[PDB]
Design an enzyme around this catalytic site. Sequence first.
Site, mmCIF file in Angstrom:
data_model
loop_
_atom_site.group_PDB
_atom_site.id
_atom_site.type_symbol
_atom_site.label_atom_id
_atom_site.label_comp_id
_atom_site.label_asym_id
_atom_site.label_seq_id
_atom_site.Cartn_x
_atom_site.Cartn_y
_atom_site.Cartn_z
ATOM 1 N N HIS A 156 0.874 -0.916 0.028
ATOM 2 C CA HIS A 156 0.026 -0.208 -0.059
ATOM 3 C C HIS A 156 0.884 1.151 -0.054
ATOM 4 C CE1 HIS A 156 0.418 2.196 3.736
ATOM 5 N NE2 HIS A 156 0.420 0.799 4.519
ATOM 6 N N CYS A 157 0.334 2.450 -0.256
ATOM 7 C CA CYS A 157 0.871 3.600 -0.335
ATOM 8 C C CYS A 157 0.023 4.605 0.260
ATOM 9 C CB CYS A 157 1.443 3.887 -1.581
ATOM 10 S SG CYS A 157 0.410 4.081 -3.007
ATOM 11 N N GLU A 158 -0.009 5.841 -0.247
ATOM 12 C CA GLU A 158 -1.021 6.601 0.463
ATOM 13 C C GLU A 158 -2.486 6.633 0.012
ATOM 14 O OE1 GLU A 158 -0.248 10.958 -0.052
ATOM 15 O OE2 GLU A 158 -1.832 11.396 1.290
#
EC number: 3.1.3.48
Length: 171
Positions: free
Chosen positions: A93-95
Amino acid sequence: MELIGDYSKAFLLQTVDGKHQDLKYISPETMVALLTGKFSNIVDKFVIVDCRYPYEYEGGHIKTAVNLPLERDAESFLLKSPIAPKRVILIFHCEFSSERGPRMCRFIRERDRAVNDYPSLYYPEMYILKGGYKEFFPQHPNFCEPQDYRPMNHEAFKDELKTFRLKTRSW
Ligand SMILES: [Cl-]
């Protein structure tokens, strides 16, 4: 639905729709199911790979997540000495889980295929956390630490963003 990457068994987790049609996405609720051991009799270990920049991670991340934003560090951490088990699952995941997370997920599969005899894989089952940290934090703040959220574009970290990007392999 298709089998996991080494065609050994079905994907274990319920999935939700996501932008990248070929990748598998899970919801914050499913991420919490993993963290609370709902799948402990089947899943030996899972790793939450936070692909955001260090300052974002430092401003609030999911408990137990590992920050591996640079491809070389993600590859070293995961494939230098593969995490063996039951199933092993990776969640990226990222932002917003739109670009950085999906890109790392694809990169790891590319490297995994490269160091194996087809169709075997060290990490046959990988997911993207739908909505990224931005959507996870408002749902489960007590599964994060610290309990805050620092966006990539935070006004006070413009220099930090530039500093980090100059360490990446490509832009
Ligand atoms: Cl990189």
